[PDB]
Amino acid sequence: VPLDGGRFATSDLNDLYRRVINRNNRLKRLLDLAAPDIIVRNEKRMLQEAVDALLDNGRRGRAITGSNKRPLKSLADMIKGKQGRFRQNLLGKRVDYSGRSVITVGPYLRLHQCGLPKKMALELFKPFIYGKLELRGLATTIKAAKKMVEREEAVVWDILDEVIREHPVLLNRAPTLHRLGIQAFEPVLIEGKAIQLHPLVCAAYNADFDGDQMAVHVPLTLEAQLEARALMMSTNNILSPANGEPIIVPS
Amino acid sequence: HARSTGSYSLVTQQPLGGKAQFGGQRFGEMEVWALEAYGAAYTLQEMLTVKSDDVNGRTKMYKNIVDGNHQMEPGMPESFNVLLKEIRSLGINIELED
Amino acid sequence: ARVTVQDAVEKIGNRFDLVLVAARRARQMQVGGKDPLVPEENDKTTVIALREIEEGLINNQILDVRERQEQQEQEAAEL
């Protein structure tokens, strides 16, 4: 891929294939010229070295490097470890309809609801309010509704007061130890740029208010809303799964 | 930082990472363990297939969700198809059966 | 309205089939053009379906009976 500028961006694996079929063509030519056996012998040695360097660069005693004095990445180390496909791309993904911010307290809340900043809620619920502006007919085409939500009319705030009326969200803190780190809440829109959070939960998340950042997520389909409200909701989980002791102990 | 739907990556059809690049949030696999600790079957399904990887699933999701529908059409993650081609690219034939 | 879902577990004692029954019912009320039974308080179909579970007049059995009856009206009213 050409990136920003004249610079190109390649995988080293292109270079690796180029080495092996280069060397293959030279072996074909050396067999065509009827060379002595030392030449074709070492040519077959280097072809074996290039193939097995391509399948696993590093199981050889010295892994070959292409540039910058650093070993290039073969097909084997595209899979293993944390940087392979498994532990990086298929088992944990980066997900849309999400966000993060800094948290704070706000003790005026019931524990099945959490504060949420209004610019985030305007951001993460764009298809919903597009669908409602198409439904009520205040816009007609989609791009008119886009111009109505960037133009910031006063009527849209009612609209995301209905789409956040019984639509729960999921909250997360990044070192998720046990299963009380993903919990669902009904939202209440507030000002500012931080997520308020009920004070009987700071023990469950192991969350102190010195500047931790929480991630939010949205259930999209209807079955996910029922899984959130029936199981992920914060009132349903007051007892530990480790013992019968409650977690909602006042700190 | 917040994101409805932004740019997507090139080698794997996944969202980007960061704030400067208009990226999404990493949903790591410890959190996956947290979801199947619950009985949350559907939420775990749509949060790695529709919301991330299947291009046809996320287009049909977006069209249905602006049409007032709430329904998913999961299919297959594209990253698994990548891994299929890549370990297929060695001398290891793997396939999909009936 | 909806703070807990305890009554749904009290009237259907599995708690894992509740997402199936309320998912099927609320899908029958949002996309399928049919009315609820509990009166409306301007809520989403989730709370409507779960509250119909709280009323005990909706479960898997009665939905099977009425879908049975609907396709009976399809093949019976087809002529």
Partner: peptide, 16 residues
């Protein structure tokens, strides 16, 4: 096949 998917695999496994 744990949460809802256990009933789903009872169904699909039952069909085979």
């Amino acid at each position: 096949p744990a949460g809802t998917g256990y009933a789903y695999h009872q169904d699909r496994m039952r069909r085979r």
